[PDB]
Amino acid sequence: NQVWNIARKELSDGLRNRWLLAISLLFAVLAVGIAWLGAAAIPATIASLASLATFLMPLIALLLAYDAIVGEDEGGTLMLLLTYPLGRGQILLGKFVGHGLILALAVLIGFGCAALAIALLVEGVELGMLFWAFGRFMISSTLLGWVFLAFAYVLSGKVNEKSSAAGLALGVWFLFVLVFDLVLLALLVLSEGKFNPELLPWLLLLNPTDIYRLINLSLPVPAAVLWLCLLAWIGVSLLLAYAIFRRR
Amino acid sequence: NQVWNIARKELSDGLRNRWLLAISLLFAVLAVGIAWLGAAASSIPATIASLASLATFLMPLIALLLAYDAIVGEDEGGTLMLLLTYPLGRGQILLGKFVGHGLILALAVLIGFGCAALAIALLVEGVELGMLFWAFGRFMISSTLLGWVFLAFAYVLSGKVNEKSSAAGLALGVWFLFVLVFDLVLLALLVLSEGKFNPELLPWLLLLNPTDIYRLINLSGFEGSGSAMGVLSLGADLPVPAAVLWLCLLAWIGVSLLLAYAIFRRR
Amino acid sequence: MNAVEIQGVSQRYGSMTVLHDLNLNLGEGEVLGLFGHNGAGKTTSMKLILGLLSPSEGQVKVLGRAPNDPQVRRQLGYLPENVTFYPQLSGRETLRHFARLKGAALTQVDELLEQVGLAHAADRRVKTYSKGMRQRLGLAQALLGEPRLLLLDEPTVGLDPIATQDLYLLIDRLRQRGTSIILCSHVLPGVEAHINRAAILAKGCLQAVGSLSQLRAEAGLPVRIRASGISERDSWLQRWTDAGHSARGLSESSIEVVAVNGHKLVLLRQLLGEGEPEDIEIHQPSLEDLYRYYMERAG
Amino acid sequence: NAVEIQGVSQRYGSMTVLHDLNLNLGEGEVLGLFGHNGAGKTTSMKLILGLLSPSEGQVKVLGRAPNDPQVRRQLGYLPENVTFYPQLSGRETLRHFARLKGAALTQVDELLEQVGLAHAADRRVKTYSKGMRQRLGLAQALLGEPRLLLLDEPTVGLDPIATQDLYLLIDRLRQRGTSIILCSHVLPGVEAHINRAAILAKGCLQAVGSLSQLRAEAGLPVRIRASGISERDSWLQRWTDAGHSARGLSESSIEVVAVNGHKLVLLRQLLGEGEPEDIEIHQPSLEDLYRYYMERAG
Amino acid sequence: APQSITTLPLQPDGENRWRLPAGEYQGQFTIEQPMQLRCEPGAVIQSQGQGSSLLISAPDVLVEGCTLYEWGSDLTAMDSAVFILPAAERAQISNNRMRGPGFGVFVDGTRDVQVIGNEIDGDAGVRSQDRGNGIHLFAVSGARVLHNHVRNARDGIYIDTSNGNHLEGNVIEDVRYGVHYMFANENSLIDNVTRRTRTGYALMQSRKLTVTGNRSEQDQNYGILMNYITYSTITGNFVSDVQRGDTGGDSMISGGEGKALFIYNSLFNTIENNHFEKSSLGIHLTAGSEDNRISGNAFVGNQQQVKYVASRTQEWSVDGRGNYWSDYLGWDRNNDGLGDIAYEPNDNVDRLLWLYPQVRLLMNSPSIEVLRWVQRAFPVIKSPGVQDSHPLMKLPTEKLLT
Ligand SMILES: [Mg+2]
């Protein structure tokens, strides 16, 4: 299968990215430095780790894949790759497998050393609950990163130059992390006569960074809808990315 | 003169950067918004510490967006090797870039703090126009100097590096270190030691950070409380007057420009 | 069993018909050279051989099939212009990666690395390659597997003439094996020794297709009869004015005649017998002035 | 006598990347450097431009210092690949180099029509092609009456109509007294317009002088190509006698490498008696001269 | 309803001093003569479940050593265990055991009455709405009530309009309210311990009183509730681990998330040297209760230190000395006890959470983490809060944990 033959490239090209390894080291140090100041000084410190991975795992995913489609078009390899025995689906889904296993390893260096810094600095942490509360944490941090991978494939296929792809990847990172929730707070403190505040626990479902925190803070909806809505953010935006990639 | 002939290019090339004009209008729409919220709440020492913190986050950002590709952006662009075969020196195509990018920062903060002054004299009725002109004149001729430090910082990290994609990593590293990491390293040194590391050395580490010398100049007379300053409350333990704080800001230019020229001389 | 049978295509985008009634027919072993502008004359037809586009009012037939069948592109090399590969990857690793996609054997990557001459620079990063070093890398993926049709879009840009003449030696090895290739070049002099049939096309239509003898017979261009030391310049200037040929007054005892090449057989008979000469050179009209004439023939 | 490099043994990193080249260049000659893209060609290219110091040897560009600011007004250098200033215009880029080189600002309008870039002037350089930037890169090179051009691959990525028009611009400059150095790699075609070549390899300058000087210093097999012949396979058996490696590329695409003692009488073996159609006698060209001189360096 | 003289008291001394022997008794009893009656420890004076068991109408009676059991439950007709009339001035009720479903010690109109050292176990089955008061005091001046033990009554030591009286060293466990105060101007209470109570100290509309050294261990939803107290004094109180809950009746208070101190419309009072430990709210300051001396306390372990839903500034440091805060990330350069930077306990996003509880879903967002940093960088958007210049660096209440 050629979905893996182009995925082994993106592991080998992604692990030699100097920009990723700087941030993934800074992600792994800050995941220890939050866990150091949450144990010596478990839901109180796993929530501060959720605010860290809402900052950096969208940023790690957008650093990997902002030049996935348009970076190959400027490099000229994209027009070459379509003349190979390869569909446009297998290039995109193979990049999603290749970039997906990178940040599925960046949480194993990120939270694999953070959960070690909790199991050896609490002295009585009751590790049967730890490896399930971090199992729900490492899985849901990959799924948050896989959304922004599919968000990066949407903005790469639309633009025609690599410089304007980073101008949209910065715009998607600003909008989906800390502009969508600031206009949720602005709909509260500035509008009260026509804004029902009961609607706002449902309005977090239009934001994959918000659905990421709700399954680390455990709510009118149950947990199982939020897992099926986080996977739905992957499946619509990957289908949206394939529809954009078929119009180059 | 050749120093102005290449300054006229960068004055006409930086102003066509659409990324520049976004975050220099962002500096303008925030300096009006802070001074209007400072007028609606009254809070005089809080509108100085908010404007000096606004130019701490943005005037290094406008300076490093301008000049990170000043040397390596011409080297990888091919036009630096061409420029040395013109009647120029390496000291004239650097000082010319410093004059050319420096007049943009002298104009990007004259729009920002210019509309900040007109959103007080046309908003606060009966304000003292003499105290307004002096305090916001001190904001104009010192946010250029903070901008000219990070302009001269960007020439250091452009002549040393050899790729523009990797130059943006160092310019982001310098912006993170001097603005909001050195303020946190000094905070964590004071919190974890509870102020008992050194009762006499610790105010002198503010002079090793030009964003903190910038904050100490504008918060000279407008001290007021202590929690409106933060880690800038160590400035009361500094025995140096305000005029030396100007001279340590010019010395941050001249050491990091002579370092910027000695690096570029062996490019 | 023709490799490329372009049968009456009309390619268009909006109101602009960017390719008007092109009809190519590439043989099973020919080396065909597409020459034209950088714009949509050449680069749309080159994209039409590949499955990147579709014939808007015609059809193309690569190897007797449609160009988007996956069995075609398992035996269809391609090297594009100005390609920079993945710079964090390696030289051997990139060709190992492209061998996995084309269905080629992994044992074939070691011969192809040294055939193009990249064994000194394999297992090094692609960012520390030259422009000419990347062109040998991009050639080596076009020979992956056993290709039956190549498309070498500008293979000689930024190459030393040792490696350029080495490249055409690889071409003449390839076309004798039974692999008809396609050149899409701008640099014309040097390529005419190995082009089996030129295919100069301007912006609108297909201008001229034929062999090099087939173009110069049709497109009437002057041959270059340049001599030196016959007896003297003016002592044999008389024969060209009497037979009606434009003759030039060259340097010293030396005769340049830009003849009309109809009499150039019988112009060379009585010239050669009495002629001493030290150093002559008879130049036929090249690919360049043929391209210069066919550009002015269509605008 | 513009460029007079004498006795330069240029080293950096204790490598000795250029050794004892004595490259004199006249007042109207069009030189061509034809080394590789290693440290052979570009070190001598950096040395003439004055941005390098010649270790153990003098360099006299225009009879003066190579880095002196009075001679740099009389130079014009076209670099290899130059994306100049992608947010600047076409005119304002060329106006900027006019103020640097001290040329007249009225020259800037008449250079954008001398070089064919009047249709795309006052547009952004990011909206320019690779060939259009070479037209811009030539336009700054002809600025302020340059007595010494220096063109580093001047016609790569260029249309052949514009390539043929560029050399007619070059031949205009030879008559005016401006020496041109072509640091090129596009060697088929450039030998019709240079005056003296200079092939250098492994640091050492191998050969120098004109084309007739190079053929006198190096016996090459003269190439006799012929297509469209009444005979098909006879020449690959008849013409293998006197060291003639007769080779074809079709049924009749026979090239013949005579040993240049038969340069007048093998044509008498073909056109004296015999019926061909497309007769093509070349001399020893640039490339086979370049091929012979590179292998001599090993 | 018999009298105390209708029993069999063996007189030890002929100066109106009596001694009741061991043995049970029955019915209500009434003291009409100044008899200093003592009792043996086996004197289980068990009533049948109706009426006030030991009514006292004579002055200067040293009731000592009784063991009372099962009196009435009519709280409207005030079925107490020890009823003390207004004419029974300076009564001493020393070291007694009581078990019954009504009022324990109901006094009214008395002066200099002494209720010392008793153990009053209220009930086990009633729903903490009809158990009756432990030590009810109704407009008494002089009431020296010291070191008693009230358990499982209704609203503990209820006090209504009693002017001058001390409450020293008494332990009150598993009751509805610990100490209830109603219009008790110029009062005092020292060193009391309240455990597992739906409100530790009810201070309603009582002025000029001294609340000193008292302890509140694991009470529910209100540590010290002060309603409308003026010119008071809160020095040395230890309020620990006020967990959430509900009072079950919602009569005078509401349910709370757990507040160690709740200041409601108290204008002037000195709140010094206290210790508010491990609650959900360290101190709740309403908008009507402003400008009072709050300096020297220890706000350690609280999940939220101050709740102050206002925009008026509130300095919390008299004479330049402030409070110790556990989450105060400050330094001390010049080696005094005080910190160097002031401490704002509340952000602007920490008061949006009180106004809108839906922001708790957004409380882990990076934008809130941005907005917490934007306030620390830009003090123009900082609403004027409840800061204190010079907060303490070390714990001042090193003795209150003992
Ligand atoms: Mg202090």
Curated annotation (Swiss-Prot), chain B:
Q: Which UniProt keywords apply?
A: Cell inner membrane, Cell membrane, Membrane, Transmembrane, Transmembrane helix, Transport
Subcellular localization, per the record? Cell inner membrane
Listed under GO cellular component are:
plasma membrane
Q: Which InterPro entries match?
A: ABC2_NosY/YtrC-like (IPR032688)
Q: Name one GO molecular function term.
A: ABC-type transporter activity
**Segments passing through the bilayer:** 19-39, 48-68, 104-124, 139-159, 172-192, 244-264
Q: Name one Pfam family in it.
A: ABC2_membrane_2
The UniProt induction remark is: Induced in response to denitrifying conditions. Activation requires NosR and DnrD regulators.
Q: How does it sit in the membrane?
A: Multi-pass membrane protein
Q: What is its main location?
A: membrane
Q: What does it do?
A: Required for the assembly of the copper chromophores of nitrous oxide reductase. Could be part of the ABC transporter complex NosDFY.
* The protein's assembly and partners: The complex may be composed of an ATP-binding protein (NosF), a transmembrane protein (NosY) and a solute-binding protein (NosD).
Protein name in UniProt: Probable ABC transporter permease protein NosY
Q: Which gene is this protein's source?
A: nosY
Swiss-Prot record, chain C:
The family database entries (Pfam families) matched by this protein are listed as: ABC_tran (PF00005)
Q: What InterPro entries does the annotation carry?
A: AAA+_ATPase, ABC_transporter-like_ATP-bd, ABC_transporter-like_CS, ABC_Transporter_VariousFunc, P-loop_NTPase
**Activity-pH behavior:** Optimum pH is 8.0-8.5.
Briefly describe its induction.
Answer: Induced in response to denitrifying conditions. Activation requires NosR and DnrD regulators.
Domain ABC transporter, residue spans: 4-228
Tell me how this protein sits in the membrane: Peripheral membrane protein
Key word rRNA-binding present: no
Any one GO molecular function term: ATP hydrolysis activity
Sorted UniProt keywords: ATP-binding, Cell inner membrane, Cell membrane, Hydrolase, Membrane, Nucleotide-binding, Transport
User: Which SMART domains does the entry mention?
Assistant: AAA
Q: How is its activity regulated?
A: Inhibited by AMP-PNP. Partially inhibited by N-ethylmaleimide, orthovanadate and NaN(3).
Superkingdom: Bacteria
Q: What are the subcellular locations of this protein?
A: Cell inner membrane
Which GO terms of the cellular component aspect does the record hold? plasma membrane
Q: Where does ATP bind?
A: G36, H37, N38, G39, A40, G41, K42, T43
Q: How does it assemble?
A: The complex may be composed of an ATP-binding protein (NosF), a transmembrane protein (NosY) and a solute-binding protein (NosD).
Q: What does this protein do?
A: Required for the assembly of the copper chromophores of nitrous oxide reductase. Has ATPase activity. Could be part of the ABC transporter complex NosDFY.
Family from the record? Belongs to the ABC transporter superfamily.
Name it.
Answer: Probable ABC transporter ATP-binding protein NosF
Q: What is the lineage of its organism?
A: Bacteria, Pseudomonadati, Pseudomonadota, Gammaproteobacteria, Pseudomonadales
Curated annotation (Swiss-Prot), chain D:
UniProt binding sites for ATP = G35, H36, N37, G38, A39, G40, K41, T42
Q: Which InterPro entries match?
A: AAA+_ATPase, ABC_transporter-like_ATP-bd, ABC_transporter-like_CS, ABC_Transporter_VariousFunc, P-loop_NTPase
Free-text activity regulation comment from the record: Inhibited by AMP-PNP. Partially inhibited by N-ethylmaleimide, orthovanadate and NaN(3).
Renumbered to this chain, the signal peptide range is none
Give the UniProt subcellular location, in the record's own words: Cell inner membrane
Q: Which residues form the ABC transporter domain?
A: 3-227
What superkingdom heads the lineage?
Bacteria
Q: Which UniProt keywords apply?
A: ATP-binding, Cell inner membrane, Cell membrane, Hydrolase, Membrane, Nucleotide-binding, Transport
Name of one Pfam family that matches: ABC_tran
Keyword Ribosomal protein in record: no
Primary localization class, coarse: membrane
The UniProt induction remark is: Induced in response to denitrifying conditions. Activation requires NosR and DnrD regulators.
Which Gene Ontology CC terms are recorded?
plasma membrane
Concerning its family, UniProt says: Belongs to the ABC transporter superfamily.
This chain's function reads: Required for the assembly of the copper chromophores of nitrous oxide reductase. Has ATPase activity. Could be part of the ABC transporter complex NosDFY.
Query: What name goes with this protein?
Result: Probable ABC transporter ATP-binding protein NosF
Curated annotation (Swiss-Prot), chain E:
Its biological purpose = Required for the assembly of the copper chromophores of nitrous oxide reductase. Could be part of the ABC transporter complex NosDFY.
The record's subunit annotation is: The complex may be composed of an ATP-binding protein (NosF), a transmembrane protein (NosY) and a solute-binding protein (NosD).
Q: What is this protein called?
A: Probable ABC transporter binding protein NosD
| UniProt KW keywords | Periplasm, Repeat, Signal
GO CC terms of this entry: periplasmic space
Lineage of the organism: Bacteria, Pseudomonadati, Pseudomonadota, Gammaproteobacteria, Pseudomonadales
> What family classification does the UniProt entry report for this protein?
Belongs to the NosD family.
Q: Where are the PbH1 repeats?
A: 58-86, 88-109, 110-139, 140-161, 162-183, 206-228, 266-287, 289-327
Per its UniProt record, what Pfam families does this chain match?
NosD
Compartment(s) of residence: Periplasm
**Domain of life of the native organism:** Bacteria
Protein source organism: Stutzerimonas stutzeri (Pseudomonas stutzeri)
